[PDB]
Amino acid sequence: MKGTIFAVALNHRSQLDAWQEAFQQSPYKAPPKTAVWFIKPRNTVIGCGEPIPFPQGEKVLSGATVALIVGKTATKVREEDAAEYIAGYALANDVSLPEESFYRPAIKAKCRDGFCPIGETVALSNVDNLTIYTEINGRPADHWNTADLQRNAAQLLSALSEFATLNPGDAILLGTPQARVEIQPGDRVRVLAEGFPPLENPVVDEREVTTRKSFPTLPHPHGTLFALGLNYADHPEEPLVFLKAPNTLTGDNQTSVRPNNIEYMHYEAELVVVIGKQARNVSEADAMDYVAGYTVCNDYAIRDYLENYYRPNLRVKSRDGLTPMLSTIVPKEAIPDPHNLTLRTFVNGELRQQGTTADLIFSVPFLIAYLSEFMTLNPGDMIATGTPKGLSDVVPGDEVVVEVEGVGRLVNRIVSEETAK
């Protein structure tokens, strides 16, 4: 819609069945214990009648589904009370490149422009035993049923909101089956279900699609939050990128909660790049013209909650208030070389982490070129560029300060669940 669009992967029993043997082996080792989440960021989100831009060369699959739409702030929603937090339901389309791997986040596959049609919210009581239909050029092409999903809408809302607060207007896509249908330029793709107005979108060669969807600017932070995995040589083939939901963000001198009964929660000091101008298919050579400037984040992780499905997964990386971020942006013109800046972390005044952006594996221009090659970057989007070596455990009472030379100083305080409540 206009809120964050969350989605669940591996929720349809047909896919769990199909992947059973693979999930016993590297790199998965074991089947998912918890829900496997992803996000369809704002560049993806379109309404009925808007085109799905088709990337030349690629195979693209429709992903008819339905989404629950949150009607009031949802934090630790109890399963039995879910309906009272759900405004209704909307037909949606998880448009995607093939789901060939579930190990690393599927950003190229799923976060392309216009890859998330979503329709009208309808006030139904439930979506139990609902057949979701796909038609292509007005011919029946696919159907599946929500009774075959592992977690129902109630259970998904409860499971996600247990650690990630949802705001009114946010959505959760309930899932998709193993078997999907292919779309191609010229196709008209229609999603249908009893009780809903059909959702229809044309698929168009991307070369033909006019200007990209723009958004109103709002005070930083506001935008897609991209984050890098391993990005310091401290002494891979392509970047590991994942997205962070906006409710993870908190300001300066706030608190971040350490879960009860875990072994390891660590800070991560990072240079954050903020986009200043809409960017698509930007070369490394002009990438810097699209940067507004720089800020700092503390990209916390709960190492205990890591799994090998879309890793690092949302239960580790999108927890409420576990991403301190400064509200100030230093303009790029104040920083002559962002690839020559010191990063440090202090805990209670003890220096625990130090490195330099000279050790970035993937440079700021590389990253901008890499992402804009397959999706539109918009003003206010953020790129958390990774963290050097020097991680350690932090516990309630601890004051954690991260600092990037010339960019800013960011304070945070760890607290217990008991203190925060």
Ligand SMILES: [Ca+2]
């Ligand atoms: Ca990180």
